[PDB]
Structure 1
Amino acid sequence: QAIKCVVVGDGAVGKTCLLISYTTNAFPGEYIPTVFDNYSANVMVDGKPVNLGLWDTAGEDYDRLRPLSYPQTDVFLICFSLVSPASFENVRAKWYPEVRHHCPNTPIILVGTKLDLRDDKDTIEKLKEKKLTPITYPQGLAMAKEIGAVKYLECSALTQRGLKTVFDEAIRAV
């Protein structure tokens, strides 16, 4: 069975590298803002073939065009950088409102990207000084139950640490 899914989230949070480091099991390199794309991957979950079709969307110049990806969606994957508290806040204000607007009553699987930036020391250099700290599991898990997200899942598009865990639940929630 086919399961349509959309990946909405702020710019440069790792939505493309998330959908690439999975469909091709390889992580690219340089960043090129996405306008809108579509991937495919057929895997078996708990013994049941699925036609997962990931819908990479943009992230504010493409807001007047983005909504053309929501039609007939069975699951959404709001995204925010684990090292970008700025994006973490836009989860409740920017994305959750918009998502539940066009396709309400559809599951939502919040996701924290760049897990590899958590256990890092170099990133902390540019964080501690900026008086801001990375997003902790609690701060996020609460944000999940708040927005009515079926599950909170954090991974790293680069290291593939629990990356397969995410998409496994997005299908289990449908």
Structure 2
Amino acid sequence: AIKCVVVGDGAVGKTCLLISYTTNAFPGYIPTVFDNYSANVMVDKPVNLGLWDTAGLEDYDRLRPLSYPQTDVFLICFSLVSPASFENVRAKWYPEVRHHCPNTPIILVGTKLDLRDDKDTIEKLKEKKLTPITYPQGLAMAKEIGAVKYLECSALTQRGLKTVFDEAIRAVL
């Protein structure tokens, strides 16, 4: 099995992405405490992928890193429509992962891709003087954190969803 650990701010869509990917179902917001999912996947070919779905809420900061030993690949996730979560990629998640796992490959994943170029979402953000994260900004952030790939997905439409796991696996094999 490959151990893939998924981290990122509360509500960015970690659980939706894992459940959408393993089951084709879309939940179902219940904040995660901790869950383990597993998929037998064909990449490039069969793989047992163990997915560790972590708590994004700050109450679990002291506990979350207990999950980290032995990880094969990390997914650091941020919502493409939440600039705070994007800044936390380098302000919180990158350092927390690296504190514990200096070497383990990171994939940076921008989530809720279906909302990024949604007009109502862009309007609401604009009122707040903010704008969705664009692909080149995500790429710059991937570079700044030495992520091995930057990928965008939607758990809702499944755009980009398979490639996230193909690349997590390619990162390890």
Q: Distance in 1 between matches of 2:99 and 2:128?
A: 35
Q: Name 2:9's counterpart in structure 1.
A: 10
Q: Distance in 2 between matches of 1:128 and 1:82?
A: 14
Q: Distance in 1 between matches of 2:150 and 2:16?
A: 19
Q: 2:117 aligns with which of 111, 119, 131?
A: 119
Q: Distance in 2 between matches of 1:164 and 1:144?
A: 19
Spell out, residue by residue over 1:23-64, the C-alpha distance to the aligned partner (whole angstroms, 9 max, x if none): 1011113x0000000000011111x21110110000110111
1:58 aligns with 2:55: yes
Structure 1 residue runs of 4+, over 4 Å off?
A: none
Quote how far apart the aligned CAs of 1:122 are.
Answer: 1.2
Q: Distance in 1 between matches of 2:99 and 2:35?
A: 22
Q: Distance in 1 between matches of 2:123 and 2:143?
A: 31
TM-score of the superposed pair, with normalisation by structure 1? 0.96
Quote how far apart the aligned CAs of 1:119 are.
Answer: 2.1
TM-score of the superposed pair, with normalisation by structure 2? 0.97
Q: Distance in 1 between matches of 2:43 and 2:30?
A: 32
Residue correspondence of structure 1 range 4-153 to structure 2 within 5 A: 4-29=3-28, 31-46=29-44, 48-59=45-56, 60-153=58-151
Spell out, residue by residue over 1:81-130, the C-alpha distance to the aligned partner (whole angstroms, 9 max, x if none): 00000111011110100101111111000000000001211112211111
SS of structure 2 residue aligned to 1:37: strand
Q: Distance in 2 between matches of 1:78 and 1:111?
A: 6
Percent of residue pairs identical: 100
Flag the structure with higher strand content.
2
Identify unmatched segments of 5+ residues in structure 1: none
SS of structure 2 residue aligned to 1:131: coil
Q: Distance in 1 between matches of 2:39 and 2:161?
A: 14
Quote how far apart the aligned CAs of 1:67 are.
Answer: 1.1
